[PDB]
Design a binder for this molecule. Sequence first.
Ligand SMILES: [Zn+2]
Ligand SMILES: [Zn+2]
Ligand SMILES: [Zn+2]
Ligand SMILES: [Zn+2]
Ligand SMILES: [Zn+2]
Lengths: 217, 203
Amino acid sequence: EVLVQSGAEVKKPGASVKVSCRAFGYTFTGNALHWVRQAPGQGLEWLGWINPHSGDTTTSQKFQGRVYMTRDKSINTAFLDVTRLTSDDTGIYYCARDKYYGNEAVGMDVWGQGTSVTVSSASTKGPSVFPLAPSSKGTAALGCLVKDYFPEPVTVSWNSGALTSGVHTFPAVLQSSGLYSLSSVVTVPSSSLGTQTYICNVNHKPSNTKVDKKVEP
Amino acid sequence: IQLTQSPSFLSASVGDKVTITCRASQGVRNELAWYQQKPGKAPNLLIYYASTLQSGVPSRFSATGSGTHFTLTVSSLQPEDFATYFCQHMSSYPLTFGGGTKVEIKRTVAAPSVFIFPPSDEQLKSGTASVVCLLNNFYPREAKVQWKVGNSQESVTEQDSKDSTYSLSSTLTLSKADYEKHKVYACEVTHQGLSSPVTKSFN
Ligand SMILES: [Zn+2]
Ligand SMILES: [Zn+2]
Ligand SMILES: [Zn+2]
Ligand SMILES: [Zn+2]
Ligand SMILES: [Zn+2]
């Protein structure tokens, strides 16, 4: 019993996006379907729900006349259309099946994997990776600074995955420029700076950018 | 029709009995649900009809509610259980989710290890410079980084599954206008695990 949603979207402000949800492993017309969104770092917002049998929809008043839900019985699929897009609409959108005990909202049972939607003026760009250089000359810290890439995500590994015990990878930050930057760091003993040669692997698939870069003092 | 979830952040240890609250500003007629969400994943249903457990949920979870007051109780917290918890009401439209309650693993106070990294030469060759302050492995998570003698942005890690601590990366960024204040740049770090503020610098 599974809900498979469509892939991540990147859109300019004022545009429109259609997100799809396909149901597997249970009969589609038996349960209402909610749409819920979560902006990063924030909580859950209910957009509305649809009855895939009747085609009935209830949209939360805030989104009425902007957001639309439809369905296709043929392909056991639900649609969400968000129009007149704004920065406020950046986040992950989930479809979730209600248990619909008693033909009523009861609780959200099966969830989709979610669909990331990003809304910005910005254009696809690979990151600039900068060394964060070790000093003195006890214990020290090394890293990468992965700057000004769009859109999310990127991947960052140290010693090409060889040591995961010391690594702290910080979430990126949406800059006033409109592009993302994050930092990656590791802690090591400070006699090791002359000896070991430090790997840095960064993958930004949206720009299809793969980057390896090394940090010494 | 507002749902207030309390508290917003809770600190607890394995084996702790723990209770979480949801107040509705008006009566819901037991049409109320509780969700658990681990970071990166989607929520799971825990409770419906505000006291009834979903199939597959451990007995250590319990809930009750009367009128405008609803509670979720874990009889003994298990490591699996540190996550964020949401309430949702079905009473009428819109169906609303509570703000959330994050439940974090409580540990002993630990002071951060502070580091400062000046911009790269390579970064300098791009016409832009960023100075970074790294706070490694502290607790609790409330801490203060100050840059000045400018506008900066901070980013925090998750709680370490191994050590149960936090880390912070602050980035002070000036390309625009070698700051109208240009001598010594520094970051003062305030945390309650430290005697008094720790400072790091160069140039
Ligand atoms: Zn029919
Ligand atoms: Zn409906
Ligand atoms: Zn109201
Ligand atoms: Zn009912
Ligand atoms: Zn660390």
